[PDB]
Structure formats: structure tokens, C-alpha cells
Amino acid sequence: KRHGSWKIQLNATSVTHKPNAIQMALSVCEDLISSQVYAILVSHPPTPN
């Protein structure tokens, strides 16, 4: 809205829970390195582990 008139755009990608902790980072790497992300934020308090 207020960040100028430059032709940059934004796309959203959020990955959800997996019970296995290795496949968490596996889904993250194959879904965000191919997406060429610039920042990674994790917001999960309610994990049983």
C-alpha cells in the first residue's frame, strides 16, 4: 500500500505440522529453497514434544 509504486510483488508460503521432526525440515527445504525465500519464521508453541 504505502511502500511505493515499484513492480515488486509478494507471495506467501506456510508449511504445517508433521509428526516426524526430520521431515519437517525436509518439507521446509524442498518447499522453500525451490521457492527462494528470504526469511523464515516459526510460530509453534503447542507441540507435545
Binding site: 527445504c29 524442498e30 529453497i33 525451490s34 527462494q36
Partner: protein
């Protein structure tokens, strides 16, 4: 503002081509001085915290 556009490439297929502005954009994380926020005045210190 200061252009130097570097992009993290697809490292999933045999690539170790490192991202040049790694620390430099981290400098942007170190110099992220703001005052607008519902939590409060968000600003990063020398430890990179609130």
C-alpha cells in the same frame, strides 16, 4: 535502496553457490530500527533481540 540484488539459488540440486549479502542483509536485521508495533517499539540490539 542500495541495490546489490543477490538471490539464494536452488541449492537442492548440487549447488553450493553462497549468498553474498548474507551478513549484509543480516546488517539490515541488525539495523532494523522501528517504532511501530502492537507489541511495542520494535528494534534490534547488538544481540539481535528486542
Amino acid at each position: 535502496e542500495k541495490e546489490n540484488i543477490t538471490d539464494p539459488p536452488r541449492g537442492c540440486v548440487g549447488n553450493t553457490n553462497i549468498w553474498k549479502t548474507g551478513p549484509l542483509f543480516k546488517r539490515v536485521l541488525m539495523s532494523s530500527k522501528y517504532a511501530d508495533g502492537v507489541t511495542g517499539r520494535v528494534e534490534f540490539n547488538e544481540d539481535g533481540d528486542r
